[PDB]
DNA sequence: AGATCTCACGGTGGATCGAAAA
DNA sequence: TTTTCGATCCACCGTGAGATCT
DNA sequence: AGATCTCACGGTGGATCGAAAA
DNA sequence: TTTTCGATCCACCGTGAGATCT
């Protein structure tokens, strides 16, 4: 009847951030100018919001938290995709797989001191290996569906109590049905920030190799994501600790350092290298940490690899080995798609330049796995790079959470307030609703080490400053 | 061509508080839905704003202040009124008078610590005594044009330096011409808050009477407003000081108190009445003030008249005299239109109940003028009651100033910022532009003393809590 | 003058209500 | 009937001008 | 853990620019 | 010509996530 559909009227409601009274006025005014069939009455817009929700049985809201049954959320996402974003029925026998990434991050909105929200982004819906639907900007907030948020300051224990809880549900989800087709989900925990990567890093030690025990005949199990994490989660820490273990057994060339009078001069050179490094960058070193052993944070480990040349010249290690390690890792966490065949040979060349040069130190299982087997993961799981929502993108999500809470929630009760915030986080991330944003300006294209560009494929849309 | 005029598109721009990017998106979206002739392109909306401004020669903006030549502002207001709000040419010989109130108030927005803005509201445009245009809500912000604002914390000296400056311009303004008619302005300084009324109260003493020297043959000059102020500005103070002078010469019944041993017991009873009043209300009394003599603020004088009964029973004065004074003043500052014939006789009855009862105290020129001649002013000048913008209305003006400064001003430069704020304060107060607001809820109708209702005519639209 | 206590109100979107259409 | 749609209601609460106070 | 320094970016509406129509 | 109209530019700056620090 009218011109605006109730589904695109909603897109106008959200792109303009209009409030209920503002939209009712926007309708009534342009009704009084005579033009009658322009916008739907807010009753219809509500009805149209009602289609974007999961059924009320699976969304539970409390004064502190709001969570959606992951199964129902995925069912809803698939339902929307098939409803509108396809020319349907062109695939009636083919097998249907929806590949999706997920994660979580805590924000500090300056009680509602901080929010710990789990998010899920469907990346790709594939029919029998062939692409039906893609996510046009997989590093932007336009499809970041919520799973749960809670007003609990992010701690280490809550992250574990959330990962185990979400994984015990990922294992249980059976495929979701829609208009006769049966779609199966493939979830990858990829939207992991830095400090959460540190918190979950508790895989401290393993056998010589679960796979290698050289042949690869020991197969791979991919569910629950544990491998990708333990292998390449960001990794950045467990290579730097081993490089430091080399940097202290350097004068003596022995891995089992219980030999004659070594440990004391090990600690003495440990003190000297640490003095010179605290001199040149004013950054602390691995020396002592209370939990899980002596370690460092990634916010220092990045500067460890920022100038591989200088740290290697000061620590007494080869420049080019640290350069190539800073290249292989800066290709993992670059956020750009990884050219797997090239990366396999670069990792091989690095493993060689390492072991043909360093034999007195034997390869720990973490450095064994990043180089010898790390390249296989990006191919076998075809993962989006370890990147998660952009700097600007995560800022947009957090700013819009604050906005939905302050200006667009009903103050009748606390539960109604989180209900509004959640059922707006769902609308504003629907795969149906066209919902515009202010045009982004071009950034300087992020520079990486020269050997990384040959490693990546730089046709993508992503504009981070600190972390992609 | 299109449906929305560039003049009503602006009304939609302001009623919805849309930003330039929001309006451009609102146009483009509903253009992509096919409907082409709905809104004007923002170029046209700018062109339509250009008509609401005074010519650029008379608006001067500085990093601190922004002021409009009052003459040009009134010319613009008359131009708008005649352009659109009339069925024109029905009055080609009649004489045209535009009656307008004005004032100023400082606000403290929590450097831009406070703003001191002068405002002007056209109330009534009259043709040869007959009404052509009225202000539908003369106590609401919908027509409050700005004259000047400045980021200077409101002090006593700036208010005087502004009143003299504005009055030296009101005296100089010649009538404004539009479409062949010649309209003459009649300005009344009525939008005066409480503390500004105190600041301007510096008319301390005069002769026995400028008019009465009983016959009224000494005529009235009405320009520059000085009379209305000195007579009834709010008045509230100069009657209470005289009532206190009575309350201390009470035991002795002598006005010239240089008599035998009186002054000391005058001060002693002064101390006793002050003790009992500081006991019952915990409010200080006139006793000592540094400037212009011993005085009080109106925020205490209102509680002086709040319960006339108790203060009179404690101070030793007649209940009914203070009751009738609290009635005559609460009819002056009630904010409702004053039924002049009834008020004349009530003032006469009060003057009688005062002087037939109190002769030993002679009438000071302020109490002489409020009662004997005060009733004539409201008739001769036909003033709106001393009320100024409502509590909710002034809150709306200050909140919208804050909004225009924060969200709807360009940050390119400080002068551009005040330019935006001012040329939005002008648009949002134009007599042409239909600009809607959220519907106000009904308040409890303000209660006054029983004798005031017979004094006023309560058909009006005004909803103050503290001060109309 | 400058600081704090008070406290009535603008604003939030769904839930209900009641006509009125389909 | 069953939907559509405007007018209120829900309850809180951030805010900002008045009031009181040092 | 909790606090502060840093610092690149979203957002503001008119001023200019350049085609493109009237 | 003279207007219309979209795409940038103007310069700041409040804000909010990272980084550094106790
Ligand atoms: K108020
Ligand atoms: K940022
Ligand atoms: Mg994080
Ligand atoms: Mg004031
Ligand atoms: Zn292995
Ligand atoms: Zn007189």
Short mmCIF file of N, CA, C and O in Angstrom, two decimals, chain A residues 289-393:
data_model
loop_
_atom_site.label_atom_id
_atom_site.label_comp_id
_atom_site.label_asym_id
_atom_site.label_seq_id
_atom_site.Cartn_x
_atom_site.Cartn_y
_atom_site.Cartn_z
N UNK A 289 56.61 -13.55 37.44
CA UNK A 289 55.17 -13.42 37.41
C UNK A 289 54.56 -14.46 38.35
O UNK A 289 55.05 -15.58 38.47
N UNK A 290 53.47 -14.06 39.00
CA UNK A 290 52.89 -14.86 40.08
C UNK A 290 52.18 -16.09 39.54
O UNK A 290 52.38 -17.21 40.04
N UNK A 291 51.34 -15.92 38.52
CA UNK A 291 50.52 -17.01 38.03
C UNK A 291 51.03 -17.65 36.76
O UNK A 291 51.44 -16.96 35.82
N UNK A 292 51.02 -18.98 36.73
CA UNK A 292 51.37 -19.80 35.57
C UNK A 292 52.82 -19.62 35.13
O UNK A 292 53.16 -19.98 33.99
N UNK A 293 53.68 -19.08 35.98
CA UNK A 293 55.08 -18.97 35.65
C UNK A 293 55.52 -17.57 35.25
O UNK A 293 54.69 -16.66 35.13
N UNK A 294 56.82 -17.39 35.06
CA UNK A 294 57.35 -16.10 34.64
C UNK A 294 56.95 -15.80 33.20
O UNK A 294 57.20 -16.58 32.29
N UNK A 295 56.31 -14.64 33.01
CA UNK A 295 55.71 -14.30 31.73
C UNK A 295 55.64 -12.79 31.58
O UNK A 295 56.14 -12.03 32.41
N UNK A 296 55.02 -12.37 30.48
CA UNK A 296 54.91 -10.97 30.11
C UNK A 296 53.52 -10.75 29.53
O UNK A 296 52.80 -11.71 29.24
N UNK A 297 53.12 -9.49 29.39
CA UNK A 297 51.90 -9.20 28.65
C UNK A 297 52.21 -8.96 27.18
O UNK A 297 53.32 -8.60 26.80
N UNK A 298 51.19 -9.17 26.35
CA UNK A 298 51.35 -8.91 24.93
C UNK A 298 51.61 -7.47 24.58
O UNK A 298 52.23 -7.20 23.55
N UNK A 299 51.16 -6.54 25.42
CA UNK A 299 51.40 -5.12 25.16
C UNK A 299 52.87 -4.77 25.27
O UNK A 299 53.29 -3.71 24.79
N UNK A 300 53.67 -5.63 25.92
CA UNK A 300 55.12 -5.49 25.87
C UNK A 300 55.72 -6.38 24.80
O UNK A 300 56.70 -6.00 24.14
N UNK A 301 55.14 -7.56 24.59
CA UNK A 301 55.67 -8.47 23.58
C UNK A 301 55.58 -7.88 22.18
O UNK A 301 56.37 -8.24 21.31
N UNK A 302 54.62 -6.99 21.93
CA UNK A 302 54.55 -6.36 20.62
C UNK A 302 55.74 -5.44 20.40
O UNK A 302 56.33 -5.44 19.31
N UNK A 303 56.11 -4.65 21.40
CA UNK A 303 57.33 -3.86 21.31
C UNK A 303 58.57 -4.74 21.33
O UNK A 303 59.63 -4.31 20.86
N UNK A 304 58.46 -5.97 21.84
CA UNK A 304 59.55 -6.93 21.72
C UNK A 304 59.84 -7.22 20.25
O UNK A 304 61.00 -7.37 19.86
N UNK A 305 58.79 -7.30 19.44
CA UNK A 305 58.91 -7.60 18.02
C UNK A 305 58.79 -6.37 17.13
O UNK A 305 58.89 -6.50 15.91
N UNK A 306 58.58 -5.19 17.71
CA UNK A 306 58.43 -4.00 16.89
C UNK A 306 59.69 -3.71 16.09
O UNK A 306 59.65 -3.57 14.87
N UNK A 307 60.83 -3.62 16.78
CA UNK A 307 62.11 -3.46 16.12
C UNK A 307 62.94 -4.70 16.37
O UNK A 307 63.77 -4.72 17.29
N UNK A 308 62.75 -5.76 15.58
CA UNK A 308 63.46 -7.02 15.84
C UNK A 308 64.97 -6.86 15.78
O UNK A 308 65.71 -7.58 16.46
N UNK A 309 65.43 -5.90 14.97
CA UNK A 309 66.85 -5.67 14.83
C UNK A 309 67.51 -5.29 16.14
O UNK A 309 68.49 -5.92 16.55
N UNK A 310 66.99 -4.27 16.82
CA UNK A 310 67.66 -3.71 17.99
C UNK A 310 67.63 -4.67 19.16
O UNK A 310 68.63 -4.86 19.85
N UNK A 311 66.47 -5.29 19.41
CA UNK A 311 66.39 -6.27 20.48
C UNK A 311 67.33 -7.43 20.24
O UNK A 311 67.92 -7.95 21.19
N UNK A 312 67.52 -7.84 18.99
CA UNK A 312 68.43 -8.95 18.71
C UNK A 312 69.88 -8.52 18.88
O UNK A 312 70.70 -9.30 19.38
N UNK A 313 70.21 -7.30 18.45
CA UNK A 313 71.57 -6.79 18.62
C UNK A 313 71.92 -6.59 20.09
O UNK A 313 73.09 -6.72 20.45
N UNK A 314 70.94 -6.29 20.93
CA UNK A 314 71.22 -6.08 22.34
C UNK A 314 71.20 -7.39 23.11
O UNK A 314 72.02 -7.62 24.01
N UNK A 315 70.27 -8.28 22.78
CA UNK A 315 70.12 -9.52 23.52
C UNK A 315 71.18 -10.56 23.18
O UNK A 315 71.39 -11.49 23.96
N UNK A 316 71.86 -10.41 22.05
CA UNK A 316 72.83 -11.40 21.62
C UNK A 316 72.29 -12.49 20.73
O UNK A 316 72.92 -13.55 20.63
N UNK A 317 71.15 -12.28 20.09
CA UNK A 317 70.58 -13.26 19.18
C UNK A 317 70.63 -12.75 17.74
O UNK A 317 70.84 -11.56 17.49
N UNK A 318 70.43 -13.66 16.79
CA UNK A 318 70.48 -13.31 15.38
C UNK A 318 69.40 -12.30 15.03
O UNK A 318 68.25 -12.43 15.47
N UNK A 319 69.77 -11.30 14.24
CA UNK A 319 68.77 -10.34 13.77
C UNK A 319 67.72 -11.04 12.93
O UNK A 319 66.53 -10.95 13.21
N UNK A 320 68.16 -11.77 11.90
CA UNK A 320 67.22 -12.24 10.90
C UNK A 320 66.25 -13.27 11.45
O UNK A 320 65.12 -13.34 10.96
N UNK A 321 66.64 -14.05 12.45
CA UNK A 321 65.69 -14.99 13.04
C UNK A 321 64.54 -14.24 13.70
O UNK A 321 63.37 -14.58 13.50
N UNK A 322 64.85 -13.22 14.50
CA UNK A 322 63.80 -12.45 15.14
C UNK A 322 63.02 -11.65 14.11
O UNK A 322 61.81 -11.46 14.24
N UNK A 323 63.69 -11.19 13.06
CA UNK A 323 62.97 -10.51 11.99
C UNK A 323 61.96 -11.44 11.35
O UNK A 323 60.80 -11.05 11.13
N UNK A 324 62.35 -12.68 11.07
CA UNK A 324 61.44 -13.59 10.41
C UNK A 324 60.34 -14.06 11.35
O UNK A 324 59.21 -14.32 10.92
N UNK A 325 60.63 -14.14 12.65
CA UNK A 325 59.56 -14.43 13.60
C UNK A 325 58.57 -13.29 13.71
O UNK A 325 57.36 -13.52 13.73
N UNK A 326 59.05 -12.06 13.80
CA UNK A 326 58.19 -10.90 13.78
C UNK A 326 57.43 -10.75 12.48
O UNK A 326 56.40 -10.08 12.46
N UNK A 327 57.93 -11.34 11.40
CA UNK A 327 57.19 -11.38 10.15
C UNK A 327 56.10 -12.45 10.17
O UNK A 327 54.96 -12.17 9.82
N UNK A 328 56.44 -13.66 10.60
CA UNK A 328 55.42 -14.70 10.61
C UNK A 328 54.30 -14.37 11.58
O UNK A 328 53.13 -14.61 11.27
N UNK A 329 54.61 -13.79 12.74
CA UNK A 329 53.53 -13.42 13.64
C UNK A 329 52.75 -12.21 13.15
O UNK A 329 51.52 -12.23 13.22
N UNK A 330 53.42 -11.19 12.62
CA UNK A 330 52.72 -10.04 12.07
C UNK A 330 51.93 -10.38 10.83
O UNK A 330 51.16 -9.55 10.35
N UNK A 331 52.13 -11.57 10.26
CA UNK A 331 51.22 -12.04 9.23
C UNK A 331 50.04 -12.79 9.82
O UNK A 331 48.96 -12.81 9.22
N UNK A 332 50.22 -13.42 10.99
CA UNK A 332 49.11 -14.11 11.64
C UNK A 332 48.07 -13.11 12.13
O UNK A 332 46.88 -13.23 11.82
N UNK A 333 48.51 -12.12 12.89
CA UNK A 333 47.61 -11.17 13.51
C UNK A 333 47.46 -9.89 12.69
O UNK A 333 47.05 -8.87 13.24
N UNK A 334 47.81 -9.93 11.41
CA UNK A 334 47.70 -8.72 10.61
C UNK A 334 46.25 -8.34 10.38
O UNK A 334 45.92 -7.16 10.23
N UNK A 335 45.37 -9.34 10.33
CA UNK A 335 43.98 -9.12 10.00
C UNK A 335 43.64 -9.29 8.54
O UNK A 335 42.46 -9.23 8.19
N UNK A 336 44.64 -9.50 7.69
CA UNK A 336 44.43 -9.71 6.26
C UNK A 336 44.52 -11.19 5.95
O UNK A 336 45.19 -11.96 6.65
N UNK A 337 43.84 -11.59 4.88
CA UNK A 337 43.73 -13.00 4.54
C UNK A 337 45.12 -13.55 4.23
O UNK A 337 45.96 -12.85 3.65
N UNK A 338 45.37 -14.78 4.64
CA UNK A 338 46.71 -15.36 4.60
C UNK A 338 46.84 -16.23 3.36
O UNK A 338 46.06 -17.17 3.16
N UNK A 339 47.84 -15.94 2.54
CA UNK A 339 48.12 -16.77 1.37
C UNK A 339 48.83 -18.02 1.86
O UNK A 339 50.04 -18.02 2.08
N UNK A 340 48.07 -19.10 2.03
CA UNK A 340 48.55 -20.28 2.74
C UNK A 340 49.76 -20.93 2.06
O UNK A 340 50.73 -21.25 2.75
N UNK A 341 49.76 -21.15 0.74
CA UNK A 341 50.94 -21.80 0.14
C UNK A 341 52.22 -21.01 0.35
O UNK A 341 53.26 -21.62 0.62
N UNK A 342 52.17 -19.69 0.26
CA UNK A 342 53.37 -18.90 0.51
C UNK A 342 53.78 -18.96 1.98
O UNK A 342 54.97 -19.05 2.30
N UNK A 343 52.80 -18.94 2.88
CA UNK A 343 53.10 -18.98 4.30
C UNK A 343 53.69 -20.31 4.72
O UNK A 343 54.54 -20.34 5.62
N UNK A 344 53.26 -21.41 4.11
CA UNK A 344 53.86 -22.70 4.43
C UNK A 344 55.37 -22.68 4.18
O UNK A 344 56.15 -23.09 5.04
N UNK A 345 55.78 -22.18 3.01
CA UNK A 345 57.20 -22.16 2.70
C UNK A 345 57.95 -21.13 3.53
O UNK A 345 59.10 -21.35 3.90
N UNK A 346 57.31 -20.00 3.87
CA UNK A 346 58.00 -19.07 4.76
C UNK A 346 58.21 -19.67 6.14
O UNK A 346 59.29 -19.50 6.73
N UNK A 347 57.22 -20.37 6.67
CA UNK A 347 57.38 -21.03 7.96
C UNK A 347 58.45 -22.11 7.89
O UNK A 347 59.23 -22.26 8.84
N UNK A 348 58.49 -22.87 6.80
CA UNK A 348 59.55 -23.85 6.64
C UNK A 348 60.93 -23.19 6.64
O UNK A 348 61.84 -23.67 7.33
N UNK A 349 61.08 -22.10 5.89
CA UNK A 349 62.36 -21.41 5.85
C UNK A 349 62.74 -20.87 7.22
O UNK A 349 63.91 -20.89 7.59
N UNK A 350 61.76 -20.39 7.98
CA UNK A 350 62.07 -19.93 9.33
C UNK A 350 62.47 -21.07 10.25
O UNK A 350 63.42 -20.92 11.02
N UNK A 351 61.76 -22.20 10.20
CA UNK A 351 62.15 -23.36 11.00
C UNK A 351 63.56 -23.80 10.67
O UNK A 351 64.33 -24.17 11.56
N UNK A 352 63.92 -23.75 9.39
CA UNK A 352 65.28 -24.09 9.01
C UNK A 352 66.28 -23.07 9.55
O UNK A 352 67.18 -23.43 10.31
N UNK A 353 66.12 -21.79 9.20
CA UNK A 353 67.03 -20.77 9.72
C UNK A 353 67.14 -20.81 11.23
O UNK A 353 68.13 -20.31 11.78
N UNK A 354 66.16 -21.39 11.91
CA UNK A 354 66.22 -21.52 13.36
C UNK A 354 67.01 -22.75 13.80
O UNK A 354 67.94 -22.64 14.61
N UNK A 355 66.67 -23.93 13.28
CA UNK A 355 67.28 -25.15 13.80
C UNK A 355 68.63 -25.46 13.16
O UNK A 355 69.52 -25.99 13.85
N UNK A 356 68.84 -25.13 11.88
CA UNK A 356 70.17 -25.19 11.30
C UNK A 356 71.14 -24.24 11.97
O UNK A 356 72.36 -24.45 11.86
N UNK A 357 70.65 -23.21 12.64
CA UNK A 357 71.49 -22.26 13.36
C UNK A 357 71.52 -22.54 14.85
O UNK A 357 72.56 -22.37 15.49
N UNK A 358 70.40 -22.96 15.42
CA UNK A 358 70.28 -23.19 16.86
C UNK A 358 69.89 -24.65 17.08
O UNK A 358 68.74 -25.04 16.90
N UNK A 359 70.87 -25.46 17.47
CA UNK A 359 70.60 -26.84 17.83
C UNK A 359 70.70 -27.06 19.33
O UNK A 359 69.97 -27.90 19.87
N UNK A 360 71.57 -26.32 20.01
CA UNK A 360 71.76 -26.51 21.44
C UNK A 360 70.48 -26.22 22.21
O UNK A 360 70.31 -26.72 23.33
N UNK A 361 69.59 -25.41 21.65
CA UNK A 361 68.26 -25.28 22.21
C UNK A 361 67.29 -26.10 21.36
O UNK A 361 67.24 -25.94 20.14
N UNK A 362 66.53 -26.97 22.01
CA UNK A 362 65.56 -27.78 21.30
C UNK A 362 64.21 -27.08 21.24
O UNK A 362 63.87 -26.25 22.09
N UNK A 363 63.44 -27.43 20.22
CA UNK A 363 62.21 -26.71 19.92
C UNK A 363 61.12 -27.06 20.92
O UNK A 363 60.71 -28.22 21.03
N UNK A 364 60.64 -26.06 21.65
CA UNK A 364 59.51 -26.28 22.53
C UNK A 364 58.24 -26.49 21.71
O UNK A 364 58.15 -26.07 20.55
N UNK A 365 57.25 -27.13 22.33
CA UNK A 365 56.07 -27.55 21.58
C UNK A 365 55.32 -26.37 20.98
O UNK A 365 54.64 -26.53 19.97
N UNK A 366 55.44 -25.18 21.58
CA UNK A 366 54.76 -24.01 21.05
C UNK A 366 55.44 -23.49 19.79
O UNK A 366 54.78 -23.24 18.78
N UNK A 367 56.76 -23.31 19.85
CA UNK A 367 57.50 -22.94 18.66
C UNK A 367 57.54 -24.09 17.66
O UNK A 367 57.63 -23.84 16.45
N UNK A 368 57.48 -25.33 18.13
CA UNK A 368 57.37 -26.45 17.20
C UNK A 368 56.08 -26.35 16.41
O UNK A 368 56.06 -26.61 15.20
N UNK A 369 55.00 -25.94 17.06
CA UNK A 369 53.69 -25.99 16.45
C UNK A 369 53.37 -24.76 15.61
O UNK A 369 52.67 -24.89 14.60
N UNK A 370 53.87 -23.59 16.00
CA UNK A 370 53.60 -22.40 15.21
C UNK A 370 54.22 -22.51 13.82
O UNK A 370 53.62 -22.08 12.84
N UNK A 371 55.41 -23.10 13.73
CA UNK A 371 56.16 -23.13 12.49
C UNK A 371 55.94 -24.40 11.68
O UNK A 371 55.72 -24.33 10.47
N UNK A 372 55.98 -25.56 12.33
CA UNK A 372 55.92 -26.81 11.58
C UNK A 372 54.48 -27.13 11.20
O UNK A 372 54.21 -27.62 10.10
N UNK A 373 53.54 -26.84 12.09
CA UNK A 373 52.15 -27.20 11.85
C UNK A 373 51.22 -25.99 11.82
O UNK A 373 50.07 -26.13 11.40
N UNK A 374 51.70 -24.82 12.23
CA UNK A 374 50.84 -23.65 12.25
C UNK A 374 50.27 -23.25 10.91
O UNK A 374 49.16 -22.71 10.86
N UNK A 375 50.98 -23.53 9.83
CA UNK A 375 50.49 -23.13 8.52
C UNK A 375 49.33 -23.98 8.05
O UNK A 375 48.53 -23.55 7.21
N UNK A 376 49.21 -25.19 8.59
CA UNK A 376 48.14 -26.08 8.15
C UNK A 376 46.78 -25.62 8.66
O UNK A 376 45.76 -25.89 8.03
N UNK A 377 46.75 -24.93 9.80
CA UNK A 377 45.48 -24.58 10.41
C UNK A 377 44.71 -23.60 9.54
O UNK A 377 43.52 -23.79 9.26
N UNK A 378 45.40 -22.55 9.08
CA UNK A 378 44.74 -21.51 8.29
C UNK A 378 44.13 -22.10 7.03
O UNK A 378 43.18 -21.54 6.47
N UNK A 379 44.65 -23.23 6.56
CA UNK A 379 44.07 -23.86 5.38
C UNK A 379 42.96 -24.83 5.74
O UNK A 379 41.91 -24.86 5.08
N UNK A 380 43.17 -25.64 6.78
CA UNK A 380 42.20 -26.68 7.10
C UNK A 380 40.90 -26.08 7.63
O UNK A 380 39.82 -26.64 7.40
N UNK A 381 40.99 -24.96 8.33
CA UNK A 381 39.77 -24.35 8.86
C UNK A 381 39.34 -23.15 8.02
O UNK A 381 38.24 -22.62 8.22
N UNK A 382 40.18 -22.73 7.09
CA UNK A 382 39.88 -21.61 6.20
C UNK A 382 39.44 -20.39 6.99
O UNK A 382 38.53 -19.67 6.59
N UNK A 383 40.10 -20.15 8.11
CA UNK A 383 39.66 -19.15 9.08
C UNK A 383 39.89 -17.77 8.48
O UNK A 383 40.85 -17.55 7.74
N UNK A 384 38.98 -16.86 8.79
CA UNK A 384 39.33 -15.44 8.74
C UNK A 384 40.57 -15.22 9.59
O UNK A 384 40.73 -15.91 10.61
N UNK A 385 41.48 -14.34 9.21
CA UNK A 385 42.62 -14.05 10.08
C UNK A 385 42.17 -13.68 11.49
O UNK A 385 41.05 -13.20 11.71
N UNK A 386 43.07 -13.87 12.44
CA UNK A 386 42.78 -13.79 13.87
C UNK A 386 42.18 -12.45 14.24
O UNK A 386 41.68 -12.26 15.35
N UNK A 387 42.21 -11.50 13.32
CA UNK A 387 41.52 -10.24 13.50
C UNK A 387 40.08 -10.35 13.98
O UNK A 387 39.35 -11.28 13.62
N UNK A 388 39.69 -9.40 14.81
CA UNK A 388 38.33 -9.23 15.29
C UNK A 388 37.95 -7.79 15.00
O UNK A 388 38.75 -7.05 14.42
N UNK A 389 36.74 -7.41 15.39
CA UNK A 389 36.19 -6.11 15.04
C UNK A 389 37.25 -5.02 15.12
O UNK A 389 38.06 -4.98 16.04
N UNK A 390 37.24 -4.15 14.12
CA UNK A 390 38.28 -3.14 13.97
C UNK A 390 38.33 -2.24 15.19
O UNK A 390 37.45 -2.26 16.05
N UNK A 391 39.39 -1.43 15.27
CA UNK A 391 39.43 -0.41 16.29
C UNK A 391 38.23 0.52 16.16
O UNK A 391 37.44 0.67 17.10
N UNK A 392 38.04 1.10 14.98
CA UNK A 392 36.88 1.96 14.77
C UNK A 392 35.59 1.17 14.90
O UNK A 392 34.58 1.68 15.39
N UNK A 393 35.60 -0.10 14.49
CA UNK A 393 34.37 -0.88 14.55
C UNK A 393 33.98 -1.19 15.98
O UNK A 393 32.81 -1.04 16.36
#
